[PDB]
Amino acid sequence: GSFVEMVDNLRGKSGQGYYVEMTVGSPPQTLNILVDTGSSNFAVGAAPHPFLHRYYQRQLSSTYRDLRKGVYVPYTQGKWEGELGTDLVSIPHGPNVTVRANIAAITESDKFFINGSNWEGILGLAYAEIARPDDSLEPFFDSLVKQTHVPNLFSLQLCGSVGGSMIIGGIDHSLYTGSLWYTPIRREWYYEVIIVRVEINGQDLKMDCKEYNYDKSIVDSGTTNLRLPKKVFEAAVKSIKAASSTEKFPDGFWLGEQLVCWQATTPWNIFPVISLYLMGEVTNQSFRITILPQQYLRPVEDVATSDCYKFAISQSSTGTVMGAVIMEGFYVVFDRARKRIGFAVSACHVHDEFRTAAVEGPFVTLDMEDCGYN
Template sequence: MRVPRLLLYSWTLLALLPVPCSGAVLLRVPLRQGPLSQTAGPRGPSSSSRTRRGASAVNFVNMIDNLRGKSGQGYYIEMAVGSPPQKLNILVDTGSSNFAVGAAAHPFLHRYYHRSLSSSYRDLGRSVYVPYTQGRWEGELGTDLLSIPHGPNVSLRANIAAITQSDRFFINGSNWEGILGLAYAEIARPDETLEPFFDSLLRQTSVPDVFSLQLCGVGFTQNYSAGSSTVGGSMVIGGIDPSLYVGELWYTPIRREWYYEVIIVRIEVNGQDLNMDCKEYNYDKSIVDSGTTNLRLPRKVFQAAVKAIEAASSTEQFPSGFWLGEQLVCWQVGTTPWHIFPVISLYLMSENRNQSFRISILPQQYLRPVEDVASAQEDCYKFAVSQSSTGTVMGAVIMEGFYVVFDREHKRIGFAVSTCHAYSQISLSHTQLWLAFICEWLHVNLCISKHF
């Protein structure tokens, strides 16, 4: 194993929003066609959290493989903006609510949105400013006609933030020129009166209130090498495609419609419970966020998890900088000792609130491959679990093992084993857990708790 010096570049950006209860600031981390019908949506609520596979009346084949990206830099989809259509690659982000695109020349953009060339653009006469802990962007609000070439066969008018100035927002070589926020209006900028893209889609079309993501990371392919950083996947808008998962879908409730907030009731490393009060896992929230690269954990939880992972993988020595995400570790191509690293298990509250279900996270997910410019003979990795000051964030490295359904109509998120992985150890299972209800009660009353 070799430990090279890591050239740090932050592609996971943190936006500022108000935190309920505490009054402090919230830091957020940002990393094909056919008509749809109502029958494409998810089945109605069931008495359990499971949904068995079934035939769909709608063919989603043209939406398969409509996502592209690079490891650690996010997944993007092609969108057409304006009249005549301008094709742009847009980052898919379930952790924000603005549709924003580059609208001025930038060293990292090969193309950008030209408002003056769109006959359908309408200026709203409002500006928007979005600060991050490491960077910012600002722009002007308007509306324009949008469509997704490899998505539902519809066109709609939606709000768009034309980014005119930015600092450390766009990523050199990422190949995306904007961001598609898919969360709820409560966290839209400049305020919740700005209707998000998906809300506009629902209001103007008959597309069902659901979308699903299959993110296929570079670690989930046959003949895998860390030197290949290209990733792909599928975003199905308006339904669920059974061809993208195996087994059953397990659902967890959306606790609050701002971010896609869920409740974690237990975390295990190598089969051993971290044995922490469940409110520690969810303070101040737990969210599912495709726009974040890492699994981010609150400080106390992160420290406990790293200690457990270090103990389980003690047959090799790792520098402290590796666990902090500041250094890479490398092995000769094809010799990565996956077997020494433990499985991380997250237990999510199920729809039946006296139960939970477990999602198992493999080292092939939480060790993120990074291209090593020094040598083509090594596979190098960055530890993709990091510390958070704003709760747990289940980012892309978690989602890459699963097919994730954002069933907004029934206020739930579904997980199933993805068909794009190459590892049979990935699993979903359920357990009776009466503490799940207690954990929810504690989480709801978190704001009056004095002990964090």
């Protein structure tokens, strides 16, 4: 019921995302559902795709209502297609409630499900504006807040076989150390934020800060990498290269086109910290989040032809995406009631004896509004 009963309600595997158990229909059908703050549709497998463990069978549900409307969602790395309806939805290890939510019954997809994963649909937690087919399709969390007395916020602790917590309706103070710092949500569509400054190992990148948000910056648990606009990526790598001079590496590595390996002997110490300064709550005030190489150098456990690592910072043409690389350092509070997102040092982030992930402030930063793109 309460927040204790929600601790540790997330599961997954490295590179396959975090999922929460949900029930849909009556009687309740159990599905595992990818937690995605980067989209706004609740969409589940509804047909026996050979790689799904379980799927939504509408014919078995007494409370199912056909909306007599289809939906077609292409995106860069894939597509799904489905039939809109509504049904009763519960979260067993969430608040003690049942709600009537929109469901897209997925009937055809390409490169949407992961071969080998233990989830079979997606929970988009972002805002109606980016819901398919349009913002009249009320996102799940909107329905949850409207139909109940669950407070309008949730928080995510992503750890990594991975685990974590999704606290629906509140904050659990044991999941973080130090204090929460809040950045405003710039516009309620994605969880858009504004980055005001970037440092590699204390050294500023000294770019026009608008480049950091071209054409936007988002917090997205449905993306693995920290993704950076192309110009920003170029400068960051050039600067990460300079700082990690001790060893040299091929161009293909930085591009995520090869891995690089060490004996059972990783010198994380040879790699720099990365700091993002975010717009703060108050005029001219910012704060910074700092991640370790333990967040951006990801063990590739599946290398059959060989301890290898993927460089998990990549180029974007869609703006900055603070994906799992960022969120695994932090307890992240999606404070929808106050249009703000909070960051605190996660009690489960992977670090060593030399260095920690950090959230520090306040700092004084001028023209922070100028960093947003229009």
